[PDB]
Amino acid sequence: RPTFYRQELNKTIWEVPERYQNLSPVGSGSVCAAFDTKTGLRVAVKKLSRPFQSIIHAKRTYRELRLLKHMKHENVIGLLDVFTPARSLEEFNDVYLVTHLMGADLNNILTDDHVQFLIYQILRGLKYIHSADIIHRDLKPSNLAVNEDCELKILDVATRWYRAPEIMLNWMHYNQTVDIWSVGCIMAELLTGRTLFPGTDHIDQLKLILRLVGTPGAELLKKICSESARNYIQSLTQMPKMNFANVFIGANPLAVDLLEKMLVLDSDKRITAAQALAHAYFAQYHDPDDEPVADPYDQSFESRDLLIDEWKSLTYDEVISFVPPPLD
Numbered sequence: 001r002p003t004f005y006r007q008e009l010n011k012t013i014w015e016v017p018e019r020y021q022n023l024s025p026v027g028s029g030s031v032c033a034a035f036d037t038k039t040g041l042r043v044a045v046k047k048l049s050r051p052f053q054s055i056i057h058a059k060r061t062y063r064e065l066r067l068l069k070h071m072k073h074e075n076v077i078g079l080l081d082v083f084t085p086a087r088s089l090e091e092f093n094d095v096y097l098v099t100h101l102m103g104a105d106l107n108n109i110l111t112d113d114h115v116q117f118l119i120y121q122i123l124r125g126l127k128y129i130h131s132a133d134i135i136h137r138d139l140k141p142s143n144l145a146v147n148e149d150c151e152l153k154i155l156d157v158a159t160r161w162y163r164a165p166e167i168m169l170n171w172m173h174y175n176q177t178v179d180i181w182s183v184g185c186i187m188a189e190l191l192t193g194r195t196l197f198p199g200t201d202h203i204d205q206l207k208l209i210l211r212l213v214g215t216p217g218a219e220l221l222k223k224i225c226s227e228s229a230r231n232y233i234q235s236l237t238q239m240p241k242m243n244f245a246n247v248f249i250g251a252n253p254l255a256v257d258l259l260e261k262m263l264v265l266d267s268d269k270r271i272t273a274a275q276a277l278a279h280a281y282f283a284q285y286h287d288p289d290d291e292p293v294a295d296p297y298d299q300s301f302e303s304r305d306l307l308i309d310e311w312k313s314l315t316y317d318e319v320i321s322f323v324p325p326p327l328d
């Protein structure tokens, strides 16, 4: 049990172990930069905001901790530490997460070669995440962190701009490739310097998307069992598939080709992360022996309806059982 110390930061009391020094805020729960003495690393220490305020906050807290404890991969943010100043369950009310501090995000940050390397990295993390039966669902430049070495990590600017059109429409059975769509949108933005689909709202968003990919065909329409949604696209302006070479003019044709394969309206046809990794565009980085998959992840909690105190107590169990990663 380490020795904690108290400190008020930006109107909030941070109580953290002495191992973490020089706390310094970085934005918004809220996050501090710190120096970690046990490792030598600059780290981010996140103090969760009202973790157990409602069933939904509590379950969300639990979910985030479970996910972070699971992720062990170079291109996904994982957990250096988790702690609470609480001495027991009864007084458990605060959660702090410690992760690697990353320089910047993609929102900040291009050459075709730079783009290859960042998109390759996102796809490699996504392979790993998808292998655990996890869908990120909110990939966007601000959720992708890069250090000065250009090394990229996924973690968790309008969300709507990067969202698969099946989510816009509230399809209940969307698959992992929603994240592939997002990557497509990010990649286009890196290669062109412009938000591919900067919708002002969800109708505008689909309107912009359909201008590029084309109104949907019979093969896709027949998979749609809602006349509501069906009657939309039918009704919505009836345009043809644009030629990506004509839209991404002068870009590497292999990049345009991968873009074609990611930005497919029919998620059953959209390329997977593993597939996109073996695409020619990543010829210079792709190595199928260095593209690992994840241990399986127990998501059964997601279907459970529990009391606040039960989500809380599960979370406390996960704090207590945390095994930090080795030094290397």
Ligand SMILES: *CCC(=O)Nc1cccc(-c2nc(NCCc3ccccc3)c3ccc(N)cc3n2)c1
Binding pocket: 165, 166, 169, 170, 171, 172, 206, 210, 216, 223, 224, 225, 226, 229, 233, 265, 266, 267, 268
């Ligand atoms: C049964 C209830 C139902 O059909 N629900 C529903 C609602 C909305 C969408 C789908 C659906 N969507 C897609 N993706 C196409 C999205 C889209 C977006 C903008 C314009 C046109 C189309 C699906 C893709 C692939 C399959 N197999 C099913 C899909 N269902 C469903």
